[PDB]
């Protein structure tokens, strides 16, 4: 009866496998292709965990259903995301748009998203739905300001944070908030988990951006500087700008049609920099803000699992 995460994730994964079956064959193969090439299922994880501080002595079906919904919405995002970025590989295999075609991927994304809505109707509180829906809207308008920001060397840090909040933190925040609201937790514990999740999410994304310069063409399943090659000016790059007026002008002149060597030069400068570490540092401060609040929660196995999971999240590198 001691909650086992591994075991919990499989129950959500099996519920995802059924949910993906379709009257249309290709949509089924595409969804399964993506589902099985596999990712870390963090969102479903935070939902299960976030519900142990409520009033259910065991995880209810209602919470497994929100977990299934969250991963399906996440997936819809990934699929449409690879169509927009002309991306090549996702989770180590071909993105849908490349294994089939562009029409298919767009359709699969709609499919995945519709299923997510079907599955959220297992929640009964009409305020959660209003909460989850307005959040998805912010996510999307976020994704738009980011595409619209592409190669803008004049953007500010306070503005990069607002961008990773809508883009990534927001759905981790919903995973922890709703997960508690499903097992009837109280104002405080929920407010507590809403905040814990939001901080993990901010740290989460900051880490991705750092790992885009420090990782490997192989472990990243993509170049490196990848985000810069697409014009995304992330935390590491904003930091090196404020303290390096040469690099700042070097970034002001940067755009898609620039020669691969001006890029190489840029991504090569960020690495021997302190900025990769100042960035990592912000991730860390963010993680402590989360660990502090996790402590203020009741002792037990759940609190031990969240503490454990929140500690890998940061001490990660892939």
């Amino acid at each position: 009866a001691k909650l086992n995460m591994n075991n919990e994730i499989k129950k959500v994964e099996q519920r995802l496998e059924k949910a993906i079956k379709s009257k249309d064959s290709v949509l089924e193969q595409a969804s399964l292709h993506l589902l099985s090439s596999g990712g870390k299922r963090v969102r479903p994880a935070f939902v299960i965990l976030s519900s142990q501080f409520g009033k259910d002595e065991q995880t209810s079906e209602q919470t497994y259903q929100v977990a299934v919904a969250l991963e399906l919405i996440h997936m819809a995002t990934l699929v449409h995301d690879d169509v927009i970025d002309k991306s090549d590989k996702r989770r180590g295999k071909l993105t849908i748009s490349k294994k089939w075609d562009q029409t298919t991927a767009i359709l699969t994304g709609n499919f995945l998203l519709a299923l997510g809505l079907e599955h959220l109707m297992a929640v009964k509180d009409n305020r959660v739905h209003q909460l989850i829906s307005e959040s998805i809207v912010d996510v999307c308008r976020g994704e738009l300001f980011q595409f619209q920001d592409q190669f803008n060397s004049q953007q500010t840090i306070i503005n990069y944070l607002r961008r990773i909040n809508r883009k990534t933190a927001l759905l981790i925040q919903i995973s922890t908030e709703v997960g508690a609201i499903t097992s009837q937790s109280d104002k405080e514990t929920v407010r507590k988990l809403k905040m814990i999740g939001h901080y993990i999410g901010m740290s989460f994304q900051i880490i991705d951006d750092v790992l885009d310069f420090t990782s490997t063409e192989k472990k990243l399943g993509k170049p490196v500087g990848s985000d810069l090659l697409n014009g995304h000016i992330t935390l590491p790059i904003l930091l090196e700008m404020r303290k390096n007026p040469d690099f700042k002008l070097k970034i002001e002149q940067l755009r898609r049609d620039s020669e691969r060597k001006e890029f190489e030069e840029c991504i090569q400068i960020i690495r021997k920099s302190d900025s990769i570490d100042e960035a990592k540092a912000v991730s860390s401060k963010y993680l402590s803000k989360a660990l502090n609040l996790i402590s203020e929660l009741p002792d037990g196995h759940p609190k031990s699992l969240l503490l454990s999971l929140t500690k890998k999240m940061g001490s990660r590198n892939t």
Partner: peptide
């Protein structure tokens, strides 16, 4: 704590949209 700052500018703009 620069994060002291920021996380509340966001907070405010989430109310006074």
């Amino acid at each position: 704590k620069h994060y002291l700052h920021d996380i509340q500018k966001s907070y405010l703009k989430s109310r006074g949209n």
